[PDB]
Write a protein that binds this DNA or RNA. Structure first.
Ligand SMILES: [Mg+2]
Ligand code: NA
Ligand code: NA
Length: 325
DNA sequence: CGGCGGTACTG
DNA sequence: CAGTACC
DNA sequence: GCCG
């Protein structure tokens, strides 16, 4: 953590680009910032800048301006719309397009949104839980939530295997939400159980809002919603559940454990090797066109364990706490 | 030049 | 489909 | 934004 004086200013720029919808420029910035944060010693030279992976001339020039003038002139020309765009796209279900649209329509505050904006069902829930959805819970509460789900699941099939993933599995002290993966060792009993589980969890008043939940489909893969533990002092928390076939267990676990950048790096690596990795499977002999798009499926490789995914990719295994990029 | 992860709901 | 979301 |  040796370049806070520069990265702190870059994260402001990255965030501005992000809420304005400039996703690839923002991405570039993210990789540079992350790089700078892992670099033990204070970069001291424009040459020493380019040196680092994720950093190039453009970014180097910025870092040079910050160490000499102790400032970044671009930070002074960030659009005034940015704080408002950030406020709006912090509503669950509203992204950069929606935020920019609301802004163009003259809205500047959540009060404007509440009173004048047209909201999707999701966004109305997002807004109702605006503050809650910005808070992190202690991992101890995540345990309680996982256990509430696990108990309700194992109540109608004790064979069900339930594991909390995401930041919880990566071992963080606090969690943004709870990610529960459910599967079954028998390979078939996982089918059409959202039906039973969600009903059970609604029965106990545990679920309060549904954000994403295709219950008309017998093939539902995920539930994204909102729960609240019983008793006083409790806040609404975001709950994400996925149910996967046992054969996809390792890939599902890897994906659902993250982090996001870790998943992307893994998947980017797989593609270099003519393979493909998703929450469903690791595939080989994947045929692609000249534009990187999948033109041919290939074969699914057997992956009983996360270790196998690493192995098939020619990588040393990493514990969840080490995937925390 | 041009890709930068791969996928699942919503409406 | 585009937008948003998941990790 | 970075990089092949
Ligand atoms: Mg999470
Ligand atoms: Na949002
Ligand atoms: Na629904």
């Amino acid at each position: 953590a040796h370049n806070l004086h520069i990265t702190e200013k870059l994260e402001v720029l990255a965030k501005a680009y992000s809420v304005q919808g400039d996703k690839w420029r923002a991405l570039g910035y993210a990789k540079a910032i992350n790089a700078l944060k892992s670099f033990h010693k204070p970069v001291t030279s424009y040459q020493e800048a380019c040196s680092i992976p994720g950093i190039g001339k453009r970014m180097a020039e910025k870092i040079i301006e910050i160490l000499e003038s102790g400032h970044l002139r671009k930070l002074d020309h960030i659009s005034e719309s940015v704080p408002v765009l950030e406020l709006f796209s912090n509503i669950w279900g509203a992204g950069t397009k929606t935020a920019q649209m609301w802004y163009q329509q003259g809205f500047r505050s959540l009060e404007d949104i509440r009173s004048q904006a047209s909201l999707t069902t999701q966004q109305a829930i997002g807004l109702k839980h605006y503050s809650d959805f910005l808070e992190r819970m202690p991992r101890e509460e995540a345990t309680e939530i996982e256990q509430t789900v696990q108990k309700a699941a194992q109540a109608f099939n004790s064979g069900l295997l339930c594991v909390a993933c995401g930041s919880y599995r990566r071992g963080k002290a606090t969690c943004g939400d709870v990610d529960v993966l459910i599967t079954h060792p028998d390979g078939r009993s996982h089918r059409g159980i959202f039906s039973r589980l969600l009903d059970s969890l609604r029965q106990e008043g545990f679920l309060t809002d549904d954000l994403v939940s295709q219950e008309e489909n017998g093939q539902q893969q995920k539930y994204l919603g909102v729960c609240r533990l019983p008793g006083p002092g409790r806040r609404h928390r975001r709950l994400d559940i996925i149910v996967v076939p046992y054969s996809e267990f390792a890939c599902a676990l890897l994906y659902f454990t993250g982090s996001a950048h870790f998943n992307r790096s893994m998947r980017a690596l797989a593609k270099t090797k003519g393979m493909s990795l998703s929450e469903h499977a690791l595939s080989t002999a994947v045929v692609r066109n000249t534009h990187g798009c999948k033109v041919g499926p290939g074969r699914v490789l057997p992956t009983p364990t996360e270790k196998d995914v690493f192995r098939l990719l020619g990588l040393p295994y990493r514990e969840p706490a080490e995937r925390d990029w």
